[PDB]
Write a protein that binds this ligand. Sequence first.
Ligand code: CL
Ligand code: CL
Length: 164
Amino acid sequence: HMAPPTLWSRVTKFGSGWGFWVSPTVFITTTHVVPTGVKEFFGEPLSSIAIHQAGEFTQFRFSKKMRPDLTGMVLEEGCPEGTVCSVLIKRDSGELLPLAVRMGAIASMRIQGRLVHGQSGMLLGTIPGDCGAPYVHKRGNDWVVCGVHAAATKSNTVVCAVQA
Ligand SMILES: [Cl-]
Ligand SMILES: [Cl-]
């Protein structure tokens, strides 16, 4: 299934990587790309944002509609093993590099000392800078997002962080 422009428009440069607008108020990203010590995100004070971070998965819920042009999509905790997702990688150049990935198992893993609650997959390459890119798949009418890019083997195996 081919990701349409509006879906790409959700993928947003953020910190040392990317994040993704799940809806007008909900933004997801990979914890380690998130800027630390700041007092606002997208011009909104922390106080106005509900933040939950665990297992390298970060979710922001804003009090205000930040992307009022968007519809809300389904966010799931990973996907069924065997599902082929697309990782919607934007590069700093502007290039779009959707990568097809056959997903494997969900697991709590230690990767370079960090606890990642995630899902591994095999590419059917990712680089530093790509973390936070969304893993998506289409089910019926609806695109589903089920993780954010977190790691890859040197090899090729990729891992996305998934929500509790
Ligand atoms: Cl775009
Ligand atoms: Cl499914």
